[PDB]
Amino acid sequence: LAPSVVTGVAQSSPLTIVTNPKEPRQPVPASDGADYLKTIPGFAVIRNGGSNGDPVLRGMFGSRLNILTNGGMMLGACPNRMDAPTSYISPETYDKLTVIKGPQTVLWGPGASAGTILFEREPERFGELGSRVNASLLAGSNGRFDKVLDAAAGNRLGYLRFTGNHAQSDDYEDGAGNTVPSRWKKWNGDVAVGWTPDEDTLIELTAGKGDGEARYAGRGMDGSQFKRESLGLRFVKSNVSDVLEKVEAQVYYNYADHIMDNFRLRTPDPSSMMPMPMASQVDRRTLGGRLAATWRWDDFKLVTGVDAMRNEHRARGSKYDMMTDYYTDADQFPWSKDAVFHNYGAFGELTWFAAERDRLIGGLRLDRASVKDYRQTLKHAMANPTANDTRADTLPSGFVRYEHDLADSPTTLYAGLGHAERFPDYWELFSPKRGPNGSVNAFDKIKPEKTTQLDFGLQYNGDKLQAWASGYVGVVQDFILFSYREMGSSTQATNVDARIMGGELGASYQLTGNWKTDASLAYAWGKNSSDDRALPQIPPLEARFGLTYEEGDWSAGSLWRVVAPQNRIARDQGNVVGKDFDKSAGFGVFSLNGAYRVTRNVKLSAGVDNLFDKDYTEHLNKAGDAGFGFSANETVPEPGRTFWTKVDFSF
Ligand SMILES: [Cu+2]
């Protein structure tokens, strides 16, 4: 059918979303992982600059989201989350994106209390000796330029695949005409070699690198380097026996090497708390693996397996000789290890196909998590009270979900209850300056976070009308909260009890053969029960309305995004990235797009985002750090009007 641009994604089962990330996207041509998530209702993004935003699902931040690439975990190194996991993903280079909302799966690792996000590349399917190529070129406002290449060749016995991209933009302008610090540049190059010695076997080795740079608005430093190195090995054996339908094994290794500074993408400000050249380098090395068997028999499906992960964080900093004005770069000093995390898990998921219109699913996992504090001193320099200390815990999680198809209509209803326990992450233990009151530090005292949540919803797969809704109510014991105090700003991590609820809904209607309309709504709500106040950093109610006309080889679409004010805030509280401070204003933004299929191999598309050049910001956008030339507590503005044009090739 006619090519179109993606402005919203509907829910396959409202709990599980499956998309093709190679599609043109018209709430702007993405750029990183978080931007692609923005077209799925329930997601919001903390804007940091022009790219590398931090994704938020149902008001939940950070490690509450389990974000995998080809089944592996890429962990960032920046202590202020300049490089969230999505910042390393170029999802045009992926084949499939799956989102599972809520604590409703145990198959993909521990602690995914908010949801699980799986970016995936499918194995090639060559018969006789063949090759294929997909590529794309995009150009747009403010020096935006992206190129993507995905090429593979092989036969029945194996294949070689190469994927790469290079993308960049200059600083954009907001709707008042002001330049925002926001320039960025990214590239990736990855290869996969698959060996398929028979129809029931697959072995695949993957290897890749990337790098990038980005200005950060409202921070004292920019990211001058975001190096990534990746290695993976995957095994899949199908139809091992009549009941043993699949055995999977994989190991992955991911390395991030991040540099931030105040002199390569900006000039040091003499009037700020960083008046001299300064650089910090940090790295993160992650090794992990997973083994899973899938059993199928009678009316039952069982998945069982184990997984393991180790990750290590190191840092080193520059020095500046006051008296002599001599600058010594960070790479002239040795790495200082500060943290090592481990996890080992066992998991199982049992599905009962209780007749054709009823399904019951239950999952369980038990995790042993541990961490060791390797900080020998703290920063003059001071003794670290918990030097070399270790702590560990054993955390069970699980869920049950009931799904029911109605007899007289194409309607599915579901209701599920899940319990997830999450060991605190690097940022919760090592980034805050203080722990809870009376603690020696955060490392010693912050407790695991325990979420119990009811998920429910329905979908209607009619002729002209597809509609879906998914709601949730939950409690969080020991929710990990950051509190901010104004030497510079400093943070304290605490555990609080919280209550959450919300939902997403959407519908799409084929009015005629050519006309189609769709809408979605997303709401999140949170309360801090320990202190009887709102939870911070909760995104406001948001609606989207799309209209598309398609005829033959062409299509045109338009889109309204309408966002309510957020008046539920908790001033000077937030997460390791950002804090609440001001209530946010409502806004509406309008966009246009079109597509033209030129041949079977060549497709063109184009768009205008924010047609009326609205001057606005989003509630979650990063509030400026105190102590610099920019205004503190002001959130990063969104881009003004921008144009873009894209050509897609397929051979
Ligand atoms: Cu950084």
Q: Please answer whether residues 584 and 8 qualify as being in contact, where contact means their C-beta atoms are separated by less than 8 angstroms.
A: no
Which residue from 133, 6, 185, 136 is spatially nearest to 557, judged by alpha carbons? 6
* The CATH number fitting domain 16-650, selected from 2.40.170.20, 2.40.37.10, 3.20.20.80, 2.70.98.30: 2.40.170.20
Give the number of other CB atoms < 10 A from CB of residue 454: 15
Identify the helix (H) or strand (E) that includes residue 263: none
Give the single-character DSSP code of 330.
Answer: G
Q: What angle (nearest 5°) sits at the alpha carbon of residue 46, between those of residues 172 and 147?
A: 50
Determine phi and psi for 36, rounding to 5 degrees.
-70, -30
Residues in the annotated binding site for Cu(2+)? 78, 82, 258, 260
Q: How far apart are CA 88 and CA 165, in angstroms?
A: 12
Residues in the annotated binding site? 78, 82, 258, 260
Annotated domain spans of the chain: 16-650
Q: How far apart are CA 335 and CA 329, in angstroms?
A: 13
- 494 Cα–ligand 1 center, Å: 23
501 φ/ψ sector (left φ>0, alpha ψ -120 to 50, else beta) = beta
**DSSP structure string for 518-577:** EEEEEEEEEEETTTTEEPSSPPPPEEEEEEEEEETTEEEEEEEEEE--B----BTEE-SS
Q: How far apart are CA 469 and CA 521, in angstroms?
A: 9
Task: Output the six-digit token pair for 134.
Answer: 């997909």
Pairing of strands 411-422, 587-597: unpaired
- 294 Cα–ligand 1 center, Å: 41
Which residues are found with C-beta within 5 Å of the ion, ligand 1? 78, 82, 260
Q: How far apart are CA 2 and CA 429, in angstroms?
A: 51
How far is residue 70 from each of residues 95, 427, 543, measured CA to CA in Å? 10, 24, 32
- 431 Cα–ligand 1 center, Å: 12
Query: What length is written for the chain?
Result: 651
- 361 Cα–ligand 1 center, Å: 41
- 228 Cα–ligand 1 center, Å: 14
- 90 Cα–ligand 1 center, Å: 19
Please, which residues bridge with residue 377 across strands? 383
What dihedral angle (degrees, nearest 10) is formed by the CA atoms of 630, 631, 637, 642?
A: -30
Give the number of other CB atoms < 10 A from CB of residue 499: 15
Q: How far apart are CA 622 and CA 625, in angstroms?
A: 9
Determine phi and psi for 63, rounding to 5 degrees.
-65, -5
- 83 Cα–ligand 1 center, Å: 7
How far is residue 525 from each of residues 68, 160, 414, 536, measured CA to CA in Å? 26, 47, 22, 10
Determination technique used: X-ray
Q: Please answer whether residues 32 and 582 qualify as being in contact, where contact means their C-beta atoms are separated by less than 8 angstroms.
A: no
Residues in the annotated binding site for Cu(+)? 78, 82, 258
Task: Output the six-digit token pair for 303.
Answer: 């998945």
